[PDB]
Structure formats: C-alpha cells, structure tokens
Amino acid sequence: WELQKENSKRWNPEIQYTSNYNKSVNVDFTVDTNGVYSEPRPIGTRYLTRNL
Amino acid sequence: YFGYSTPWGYFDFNRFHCHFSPRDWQRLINNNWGFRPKRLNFKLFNIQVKEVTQNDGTTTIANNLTSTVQVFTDSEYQLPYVLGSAHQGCLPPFPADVFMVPQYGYLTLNNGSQAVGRSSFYCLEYFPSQMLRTGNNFTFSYTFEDVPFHSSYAHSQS
Amino acid sequence: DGVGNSSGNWHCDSTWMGDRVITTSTRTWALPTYNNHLYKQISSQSGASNDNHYFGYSTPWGYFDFNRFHCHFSPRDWQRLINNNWGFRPKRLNFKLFNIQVKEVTQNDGTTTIANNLTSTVQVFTDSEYQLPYVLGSAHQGCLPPFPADVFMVPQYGYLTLNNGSQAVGRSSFYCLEYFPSQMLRTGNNFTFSYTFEDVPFHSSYAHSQSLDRLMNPLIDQYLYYLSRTNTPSGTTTQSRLQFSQAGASDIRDQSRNWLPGPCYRQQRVSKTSADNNNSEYSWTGATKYHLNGRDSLVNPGPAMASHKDDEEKFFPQSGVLIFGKQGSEKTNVDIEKVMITDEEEIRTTNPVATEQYGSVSTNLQRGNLALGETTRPARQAATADVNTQGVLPGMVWQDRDVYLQGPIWAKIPHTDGHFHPSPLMGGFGLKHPPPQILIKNTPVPANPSTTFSAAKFASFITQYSTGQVSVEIEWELQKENSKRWNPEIQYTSNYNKSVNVDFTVDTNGVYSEPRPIGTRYLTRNL
Amino acid sequence: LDRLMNPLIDQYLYYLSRTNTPSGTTTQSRLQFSQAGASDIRDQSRNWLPGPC
Amino acid sequence: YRQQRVSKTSADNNNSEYSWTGATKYHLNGRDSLVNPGPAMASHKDDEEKFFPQSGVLIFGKQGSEKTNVDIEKVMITDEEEIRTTNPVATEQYGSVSTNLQRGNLALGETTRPARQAATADVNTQGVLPGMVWQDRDVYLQGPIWAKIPHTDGHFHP
Amino acid sequence: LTLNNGSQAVGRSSFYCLEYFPSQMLRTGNNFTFSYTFEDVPFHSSYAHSQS
Amino acid sequence: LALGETTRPARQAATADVNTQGVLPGMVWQDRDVYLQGPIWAKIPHTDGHFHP
Amino acid sequence: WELQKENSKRWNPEIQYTSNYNKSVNVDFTVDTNGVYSEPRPIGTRYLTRNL
C-alpha cells in the first residue's frame, strides 16, 4: 500500500481514533471467553482534517 | 459562521484591471480568440515603517528606522485560501491610487455560532516568514499550470 | 550589518523526518533595566520563619528560558510525538538573537516619548563553563510563550547562596556578571551559538500493558512451594502443623517473583471533593518533607509514584503531583477549579501508589507455648508493620515522572560526589552539562555628567530598554513504536462535540489558553 | 539544595497552601492552592533530594 | 526486608494462621502480593539451622509431591546461610538507629530541665545505602537459570 | 496476563494474536534451528567468603 | 461527613519522622573528607554487588 | 603579568590570606543591600615566607 503523509499547519489537536480507557468486561476487537472474535463498531477512515 | 481574524494583511491582484488597462484590454479583446496566464513575478520594496504619536489634539508621525515588516507566501497551500471569493482590496485599477492592505481572516466548521471539534485554528507566525527592514525587499516568481485558454470569441452559429 | 538591514528572519516551524524532528520557534522579547543598573544584596525579612530564610544577590542581567516543552512543540506537533512514538530525547540546539533595537524613553509632565537610540548596545553572553549559579530547571516563569504571537518580558537574574538565618556565611559567594567576556550588540548586530546534548535516556512515552504483580502464565503452576497454612484442626482445639502449597492461578498473590516495585516516600491523600477532606490545617503539619541544616522543606514532586489506585481518581497526593494553573490564575490561595492537577496513574503498574505504604514487614519473632521450666513459655505471636518509606533495594524496577507539554524539559544534575538515577523529580532529562544560560543586559548610558570632576559613582542614566526577536531550534530524536498488539491503542483526541471555544486556541478577546495538561504516555508496551 | 533557585521569580507550579476556610463562626474545609515565591521558599518544587541517612 | 521466622520443628511454632497476616509483602494498585524470595539475605544465624524465613527461601518439592497443603517432609527447603558473612539474617533487623536527642538535667530557669535519655529503635527495613556490599541468591541446580529485566526507566542491580 | 480492574479489562489492556507473526510450518521431514548469544553478564558467585 | 456510615469519625492527618533513609532516585550527596592524618584508600570487598564504593 | 613561583622546603604551614568563616550581615568585597560596593580592609601582599 502506498501512503500519503499528512502535512498541515493546524495548531490545535486533531481528532484521532481511540479505544476507551474505562474498564470493560471484554476488550474491543478481541476474542471473548468462548473464543469468538468480534468487531464492536465500524471503524471509518476520515479523522485527520484538511482545509477545503 | 465561526472563524478567526488575524493581525496579518494580504495582497490581492486577482482582478484583471490590476494588470490590463482599458486600452491594453482592448488590444486583447478585439484581436484574439483567447488567452491564459503563464508566469508571474512579485516584488515588495521601498518599505518604510512609521511610528505615530498622539499627544492632546495633535498627531506626529516619524520614521522608525529599525522596525521590521514580515512577509511570507505559502507555496504549500497550508492556510485557508481567501482569494477567489471576489473580495475588495485589490490593487487599484488606476496606477496613481494608493490602497490599504486588507486584513486576513478565515472561516471554519460551525454548529450554529459554536465551533466543532474538527474546526481548525491556524497561527500565521508558525510559518517561516521573512522579516524586512527599510532597505530590504521581497521577491518571488510563480508559474501557472496548464489551463485552457479563455474563449474571447462568440459563436456565429447556434 | 546596518541600521536598515534585518539581522535575521522569522523561523518558526517543525519538520518531521521520521527518525528526528526539528522544532524551530521565534518570539519577540522586551528587556527592561533591572535594579537601575546595579547589583543588590537580598535576604529574607526579619522574623520570617527559619524554614524561609535565604541570602543572595539580584543582578541587572536578564536571561532567556526555553526550558518548557510548549516553547517548542505545538498542541498538534505534540500529538504527533505523543501518539506515534515510544520515546524521544533532544540532540542539538541552535540559538539566535537578532533584530535588536534599543529605545530611550523620556517622561516630561504627563506625557512619555519613546525614540530610537541607535548607538546604544545590548550585551549578551552564554556561560559554557557553568561558572554561575544555575537558575534554570527550578520551574520559574518567564519562558518563551506557548503561542508564537505573544510577546514576553525577559526575566531578571538572581541567585541564592549560603545563609545562617538571614545573614551570610564566609563561604557564601558573590558573582559579578560583567566579569565575564560578553558580546556587545548594537542595532544591526546579532548573536548565535549552538549546543549538543549529551547522551541521555529516551523519555518513556509508553504505559505498560502488564504489572509486576501479574507477570506470568495463568495456565501453569509453578514448581516452587510457599507456606500456605500453619495450624491444623486436631480434636476440638487446633494444633500447629505447617503445610506448603504450590502456587497456581488462584494463588496469584502467593507466587514467587523475580522483581519488586519501585521505592516510595509517602504523601498524604487529599480528595478533589472538598467535603471528603478533614477540617483543619494539614497543608503543612500534614505535609511530607525533608530537612537540611535544621530547616524543613516540602517535597512537591517527590519520587515518582502513582497518584491513586483503581477507581480512586477523586484522590491525589497532597504535595506529590505537578499542578498547573488555568489561564489567568492568580498567584495565591486560588481554588481547586482554577488549577490543573496532573495524573500519574499510568505508572501504577510498577511504582507504588503515593498515598499507600510500600508494604508490610515482619517485626517480632514468633514462638509456641510449649516449653519446659522456662520463662519463655508465653507464645507471643506473629507481628508486622507497614513500611511507609522504602529506599532502593536490589531487584527493583520503576518509572520516571512524565513530561507534560507545559512542564520542564531538563534540569542540571548538581556537581557532587554521588548521584542515584539522576532523573529530575519534576520530570525531564537530567543533564550534567545542560543548555547554558544566556544572559542579556542593557548597557548603561550616563546622563549629562557635571562639568567639574567628581569621583562619586554615577546615579543618573538615560532611561531606556530594548527589544528584538529570539529564535530557538532543537533537534529531537524519536524512538519508533514496534508492537504486535492486535486491538487498538489509546490515543490523544480532541472532543468532536460542539463547543463555544476550540481547545488550545485564542478566545474572542485574543487570549490563548491551554485547557488541560497533556501527558505523554498513551501507547502501550508490555512490561 | 533547599535554596537552589531564583529569588526574584515565582514558579509556575502550584502547591496546596491552605486547607480549611472560615465560614460563619466555625470553619469549613475548602482547599486552596498558591504559587510559590521567595517568601514561600520551603514550599517550592524541586528536582532533587538530600543524601541518605 | 524482614521475614517472619518459622522453625522446622512444628512444636516450636505458634498455633494460629500467620501464613498470610504474618507474611511480608508489598502492594501495587491496592492489592497485596507476598514476596517469596525477597532480597537476598541469610536464612539463619549460627546454630539456628532449625529455623528459616517464612516466605524468604526457595522451596523445592520431593519427587511425587502433591500440589496443595503438603507436609514439611515432602518439600526441600533451600539454605542460604553461606551468605551470613555479608547479607543480614532474614529474620533479624538490619540494626538499631538513634531516635531522640539526649540531654542533661542541668538547666537554669528552664522548662528543658528534664534530662530525657538516649533512645534507639530497630530498623526492620533498609534500602541501599552508600558503602554497602552484598551477595546475590544462589542458583540451585533444579532452580532457574535466567530472567528478563522488565523494560523500565530504571533498575537497581538487576 | 494483562491489565485488570477487578476481574474486568481496562482500555490499555493488550490482546496478542500469535498467528500474526511470521512462523515456520514444519511437516514430517522438516526441522527447525536457531542460535542465540547471551549478552555480557556477571559471573555467578560459586564461592563463599572466608571472612565477614 | 458521611451518611449512615461507621466511617463518620473524621480521623486527621498524621506523620512520622523517618530516622533511616536508603538511597532514593534523585538524591545527591557528598563523601567523607580525607584528613591528612587519615586513610588514603581501602579495598572494595569482592562481592556480587556494591553501591557507591 | 609575570609570576615568580614559590619554591621552599618549609615544613610547617604558611600564613595565607583568608576570609572569615563566621556569619556576617554583609559579605566582604561585595555590594550591600543598596548596591554600593566596598572594600573592607587593605589587602597587603607579603604572606608566604622566605628565609633571609
């Protein structure tokens, strides 16, 4: 895959994709106690911001 | 809307009368099927900074010889692009006029009058810029990309 | 060189080359004349408490302080560093002064005139031999501002020396800063120097995905035994028969381990909810502190250790964390809502919790009732005591304090016969030869001497100050994150919901603010 | 070590200066923070500790 | 870091459960963890071989030893005594340290006239101090060859 | 084992899939080898002191 | 302040003098002086570990 | 300035120029609280001793 790197002068921070830090019975994107792997949510793409 | 006003000014030549004159325009318009721009050169020079002092009902203006003016051009297109919105503050049509330099500001995402997390803030002192003191000048050159000729003709058929 | 030529340009910018990163920043400064050109003795006042006495000297000189991270990184640049990397250290720096212009100010009646003084000089030196008291790294204010469009005043230089009470001692030193070769700059002159950081450990920008207490395989028992049970039921009344077990996954606390947590010096626990806390003044009597020469000194950062355990986030060590002010916070006695309290919890994996003991230690020697014609017949019993302070012990592992973008970059290790793990307790990189101090002064310009000779000192000078721009360029080395972790990491994110103001931005009045402390450790490593 | 720093400049760190506050006749607990100057010297934040004992 | 002393003769030991409440332990994140090996230190002094630290030695099983609650006769208790030369004995304190400041009775018009006296206290835990020498735990052919130092900002004598 | 709060996972807790590593597949008649060099480490002390 | 709790007694902040301190990270110290009629040197024992010999 | 170094077989110690170690309100050869620099005493020269 070829990547296009992000070059921006934006000052304030970007929005990023983050997994929640709170405690949970199961970890996201992981097998459960029965061995079944699951994907909790659709993960999109657009996060970093460009000016139009 | 939501946005930020900046201390910076900017130069706008984006109107044709900044370049052509009513006669020059006429040579273009009558004699040609079309045209496009190719290169440009830009220069700042004979820069002089004045300090202004107001005591009571009088105002004095004097040279400040050591003050600087700082200028940059963004060639990487990293700031919101204000030109091409048909704003005013172009170089005047008539060469003997003197013009004020417009203030730079930009808009970003809004929800109502409130900002959104994706909305951007740009600091223009975060760009390398050239500082000019009286006796210093600024230049750069630019090459237009290939673009279709404008059509200066009308059709004799439908 | 000249009156009408610029001495340098504005370089503020950041380049990420994938191994290194260079952060350049330029600011505008203003430099008064401090102490009306003359040195002064300073000391604590009269009946000040013994803990607060001091003796020293204030100087006419100013100094430049870039020692805070936000002088270099920007909230976005910081985010690229923090999310993508295991660590980092500084490499070289460049420093420049330029576009220097000196202004004379005249006050007649109710008006003030300011004019150029073209022939005046500003004089600047950096001490590369570390021959002056080193003020940087004390977390003083007067850094280059976070936001590049701000203008800052240059701080005044002063230092402390030995004291007995408010009085000097024979070993106390006096330093004259005009006794150093210094460079004099007139408008059209500029100053530069470069500096190379010594080899220093990368800061750890990661948190551990494991803790010492669970380091091992749940599925397999050990082959070591521990003492599981002591007495045994015999008839009605039990008797003592000691028995051993082999520690499994339900025994986890009992398993044998190769390592121990980092050391501790306790803190008192206060809660962010004002109703939970006791009603009294414990702010001093309850504080944790040391003393030299018979005078107590509070320990604010202390040794690095976690600020609270699971689901206690309400709490935090009394003195034991860094606390930052919100924009426009007053100096003294300001509310909990006006400060930003840093949170060290990511280190709970290794370091102890600051408000709880290192552990418990045995005290007496147990015995049994059984004896023959002995005064030793009383059986006593096993006793234990909480160890509230633990010095470093063989086989201990720990983590240093985090960095915190508005916190300190470095500090100078004192010059001493011995050190242990010279990492500054405020955080940052301990350096034997830090970036040198850059000292700056307005050269005096006497005003109208008398026509007949007088051997007395000049008390009358032209009132004046100077200004100009300062540029700092630091090169940072990065340690890239290589991990097989499957699930996603935690990242630093700005909220996507609507808000009146954007975080890390100027408001409608033009005031730039930093909403929260931004830490470092996000990406996770296994221990 | 205990005096290592600049007397003339305050720090930018805060410490917990005062715990309770007068309320009516009988005080209540409201914790307040101060920023350590030259009269606070014992309260300032420091990077180092004395040797062992 | 002290251990409790238990004797291999079951009649000498107290009748109770001290196996946990009496154990030496640390805690991270608010949960106690027994320290089995502990820092390396001798298991007993001269002619005490009957005794040994509660958790403080490696214990190996004899061939065919059951997992849980197995007798003293089914285990093999290692003996660290060869280190008594340098390291402290695990069941006894590092030493004693002064506490108060002594003075005399003699004073003139003073409330300080009571003479007090010299006091001292056993130091049950000692962190590393300048000028200390020690010996590491022995190897023990059925014991471990190596371990991984955690990846951390600092270590001491890994 | 990984981070826990009680018996529950925490957001920083990690999941490792071991099929996500290049691994060598061996069929009867295939063998596996590798070599390793220990880093410099102090000699163990196999001696006792004749002095205290 | 508590509601239906046996934890209502407020206790108070307590502290204790530390009479022995082992080396802790971030400590600096000075060695004993020499004293012209005192010792020049000594032999470090041969041992698995030392600290600041 | 050219220096002439001191070569002597004297056994006992020389007299030296020393600043007093006792506490004092002001340090010798230093500015005071008003910024005035003062020299407390004449400092001579002859200290080291030669045989005649």
- Max distance between CA atoms of chain G, in angstroms, equals 72
Neighbours of C195 (CB within 10 A): 17
> Any chain B CB within 8 A of the CB of A3?
no
Measure CB to CB from residue A27 to each of C75, C487, C502 and give the nearest one: C487
B1: buried, middle or exposed (CB in 10 Å: 19+, 13-18, 0-12)? Answer: exposed
Find chain E residues with C-beta within 8 A of G43's C-beta. none
Phi then psi dihedrals of residue C79, to 5 deg:
-70, -35
Instruction: State the nearest Cα–Cα gap between E82 and chain F, in angstroms.
Output: 6
Find chain G residues with C-beta within 8 A of E123's C-beta. 19-20
Measure CB to CB from residue C389 to each of G12, G18, G30 and give the nearest one: G18
> Any chain D CB within 8 A of the CB of E131?
no
| Helix runs in chain B, H state only | 22-31
Q: In the structure encoding, which two tokens stand for residue C22, read together?
A: 């260079």
Find chain E residues with C-beta within 8 A of D52's C-beta. 127, 129-130
| A5 contact partners, CB below 8 Å, separation of at least 6 | none
| E126 contact partners, CB below 8 Å, separation of at least 6 | C391, E88, E94, E95, G20, G22
Q: After which residues is chain H broken (C to N over 2.5 A)?
A: none
Find chain B residues with C-beta within 8 A of A17's C-beta. none
Residue indicated by tokens 């660290």: E80
Residue indicated by tokens 């061996």: F26
In angstroms and rounded to an integer, the radius of gyration of the C-alpha atoms of chain A is 16
Q: In E62-134, which ranges are E strands?
A: 70-71, 75-77, 95-98, 120-123, 132-134
Instruction: Give the DSSP per-residue string, C325-390.
Output: EPTT--SSSEEGGGEEE---GGGTTTSPBTTS-SEEEE-S----S--SS-TT-S-----EEEE-EE
Task: Judge: C2–B123 Cβ closer than 8 Å, yes or no.
Answer: no
User: Do residues C9 and B129 lie in contact, with contact meaning Cβ atoms separated by under 8 Å?
Assistant: yes
Alpha-carbon distance C205 to C521, whole Å?
Answer: 4
Task: Judge: G27–C417 Cβ closer than 8 Å, yes or no.
Answer: no
Find chain F residues with C-beta within 8 A of E84's C-beta. 52
Phi then psi dihedrals of residue C211, to 5 deg:
-115, 155
Alpha-carbon distance C95 to C439, whole Å?
Answer: 13
Neighbours of B26 (CB within 10 A): 11
Instruction: State the nearest Cα–Cα gap between G25 and chain E, in angstroms.
Output: 9
- Nearest-Cα residue of chain C relative to residue D41: C52
Planar angle of CA C63, C68, C74, nearest 5 degrees: 125
Neighbours of C310 (CB within 10 A): 17
Alpha-carbon distance B126 to B70, whole Å?
Answer: 13
Residue of C324, C323, C319, C325 whose CA lies nearest to C300: C319
Find chain F residues with C-beta within 8 A of A22's C-beta. 10-11
Instruction: State the nearest Cα–Cα gap between F51 and chain G, in angstroms.
Output: 10
Instruction: State the nearest Cα–Cα gap between E39 and chain G, in angstroms.
Output: 12
> Any chain H CB within 8 A of the CB of C58?
no
Q: What is the DSSP pairing of strand C121-127 with strand C437-442?
A: antiparallel
Alpha-carbon distance F11 to C346, whole Å?
Answer: 12
Q: Strand pairing partners for C113?
A: C106
Instruction: State the nearest Cα–Cα gap between C322 and chain F, in angstroms.
Output: 23
- CA E121, distance to chain mean position in Å, is 17
Alpha-carbon distance C61 to C179, whole Å?
Answer: 13
Alpha-carbon distance B32 to C254, whole Å?
Answer: 94
User: Do residues E90 and E73 lie in contact, with contact meaning Cβ atoms separated by under 8 Å?
Assistant: no
User: Do residues C83 and A20 lie in contact, with contact meaning Cβ atoms separated by under 8 Å?
Assistant: no
Alpha-carbon distance C211 to F4, whole Å?
Answer: 9
Alpha-carbon distance B91 to B146, whole Å?
Answer: 25
Phi then psi dihedrals of residue B16, to 5 deg:
-65, -40
Q: Which helix (H) or strand (E) holds E53?
A: strand E51-53
Q: In the structure encoding, which two tokens stand for residue B134, read together?
A: 């009286």
DSSP B23: H
Exposure string for E44-70, b = 16+ CB within 10 A, e = fewer: beeebeebbbbbbbbbbbeeebeeeeb
- CA C78, distance to chain mean position in Å, is 17
Number of alpha helices (DSSP H) and beta strands (DSSP E) in chain H: 0, 2
In angstroms and rounded to an integer, the radius of gyration of the C-alpha atoms of chain F is 22
For H:7-46, CB contacts with C below 8 A are: 19-27, 29-37
Find chain G residues with C-beta within 8 A of F42's C-beta. 48
Alpha-carbon distance F9 to E140, whole Å?
Answer: 38
User: Do residues B151 and B40 lie in contact, with contact meaning Cβ atoms separated by under 8 Å?
Assistant: no
DSSP-derived 3-state class of residue E81: helix
**CA dihedral of C276, C282, C287, C292, whole degrees rounded to 10:** 180
Q: In C461-520, which ranges are E strands?
A: 464-480, 505-506, 512-513
Q: Strand pairing partners for E98?
A: E120
Q: After which residues is chain B broken (C to N over 2.5 A)?
A: none
Alpha-carbon distance C24 to A38, whole Å?
Answer: 45
Instruction: State the nearest Cα–Cα gap between G14 and chain D, in angstroms.
Output: 15
Neighbours of C5 (CB within 10 A): 14
Find chain E residues with C-beta within 8 A of F48's C-beta. 82-83, 85
3-state helix, strand, coil in chain F (%, to 5): 5, 10, 85
Neighbours of C468 (CB within 10 A): 25
Ramachandran class of C510: left when φ > 0, alpha when ψ lies in -120 to 50, beta otherwise: left
User: Do residues F3 and F13 lie in contact, with contact meaning Cβ atoms separated by under 8 Å?
Assistant: yes
Find chain C residues with C-beta within 8 A of E132's C-beta. none
Phi then psi dihedrals of residue C331, to 5 deg:
-65, -55
Measure CB to CB from residue B122 to each of A7, A9, A15 and give the nearest one: A9
Instruction: State the nearest Cα–Cα gap between C56 and chain D, in angstroms.
Output: 8
DSSP-derived 3-state class of residue B125: helix
Task: Judge: H33–C40 Cβ closer than 8 Å, yes or no.
Answer: yes
User: Do residues D36 and D15 lie in contact, with contact meaning Cβ atoms separated by under 8 Å?
Assistant: yes
User: Do residues E11 and C240 lie in contact, with contact meaning Cβ atoms separated by under 8 Å?
Assistant: yes
| C432 contact partners, CB below 8 Å, separation of at least 6 | C198, C412, C413, C415
Alpha-carbon distance C29 to C13, whole Å?
Answer: 19
C3: buried, middle or exposed (CB in 10 Å: 19+, 13-18, 0-12)? Answer: middle
Alpha-carbon distance F6 to F13, whole Å?
Answer: 13
Instruction: Give the DSSP per-residue string, C2-52.
Output: -SSS-S--B--EEEE-SSEEEEEEEEEEEE--GGGG--EEEE--TT--GGG
Residue of E79, E90, E85 whose CA lies nearest to E126: E90
Residue indicated by tokens 């001490």: C127
| F28 contact partners, CB below 8 Å, separation of at least 6 | none
| C13 contact partners, CB below 8 Å, separation of at least 6 | B126, B127, B128, C24
B75: buried, middle or exposed (CB in 10 Å: 19+, 13-18, 0-12)? Answer: exposed
DSSP C206: -
Task: Judge: G27–D52 Cβ closer than 8 Å, yes or no.
Answer: yes
DSSP-derived 3-state class of residue E40: coil
A and F make contact (3+ CB pairs below 8 Å): yes
Q: In the structure encoding, which two tokens stand for residue C381, read together?
A: 């019993």
Q: In chain A, which ranges are E strands?
A: 30-31, 37-38
- CA C330, distance to chain mean position in Å, is 21
Whole-Å CA distances, C263 to C270, C349, G21: 21, 13, 11
Alpha-carbon distance C455 to C246, whole Å?
Answer: 92
Q: In C111-196, which ranges are E strands?
A: 111-116, 121-127, 151-153, 156-161, 183-186, 191-196
Residue of C389, C271, C402 whose CA lies nearest to C346: C402
- Nearest-Cα residue of chain C relative to residue E131: C418
Neighbours of B87 (CB within 10 A): 12
Find chain F residues with C-beta within 8 A of C214's C-beta. 1-2, 4
- CA C446, distance to chain mean position in Å, is 42
For C:461-490, CB contacts with F below 8 A are: 484-487, 490
Whole-Å CA distances, C52 to A23, C280, C290: 46, 23, 14
Measure CB to CB from residue G23 to each of E97, E127, E136 and give the nearest one: E127
Task: Judge: C116–B64 Cβ closer than 8 Å, yes or no.
Answer: yes
Find chain D residues with C-beta within 8 A of E129's C-beta. 52
Find chain D residues with C-beta within 8 A of G26's C-beta. 47-49
> Any chain B CB within 8 A of the CB of C526?
no
Q: In the structure encoding, which two tokens stand for residue E110, read together?
A: 């003073």
Phi then psi dihedrals of residue C337, to 5 deg:
-80, -15
Residue indicated by tokens 């009646």: C109
Q: In the structure encoding, which two tokens stand for residue B46, read together?
A: 């004979």
Residue indicated by tokens 């050159």: B141
- Nearest-Cα residue of chain E relative to residue F49: E85
Alpha-carbon distance C413 to G27, whole Å?
Answer: 10
For chain E, what's the residue count?
A: 158
Alpha-carbon distance C267 to G26, whole Å?
Answer: 17
Instruction: State the nearest Cα–Cα gap between C316 and chain F, in angstroms.
Output: 19
Instruction: State the nearest Cα–Cα gap between F20 and chain E, in angstroms.
Output: 23
Q: What is the DSSP pairing of strand C429-431 with strand C410-412?
A: parallel
Ramachandran class of E140: left when φ > 0, alpha when ψ lies in -120 to 50, beta otherwise: left
Q: In the structure encoding, which two tokens stand for residue C431, read together?
A: 């350096």
Residue of B18, B149, B138, B132 whose CA lies nearest to B68: B132
DSSP E103: -
Expt. technique:
cryo-EM
| F36 contact partners, CB below 8 Å, separation of at least 6 | none
DSSP-derived 3-state class of residue F19: helix
Task: Judge: G23–E123 Cβ closer than 8 Å, yes or no.
Answer: no
- Nearest-Cα residue of chain B relative to residue C72: B126
Q: Which helix (H) or strand (E) holds C390?
A: strand C389-390
Residue indicated by tokens 């990547």: A3
DSSP-derived 3-state class of residue B39: strand
In this complex, which chains have at least 3 CB pairs below 8 Å with chain C?
Answer: A, B, D, E, F, G, H
Task: Judge: C244–E74 Cβ closer than 8 Å, yes or no.
Answer: yes
Phi then psi dihedrals of residue B125, to 5 deg:
-80, 0
Neighbours of C428 (CB within 10 A): 26
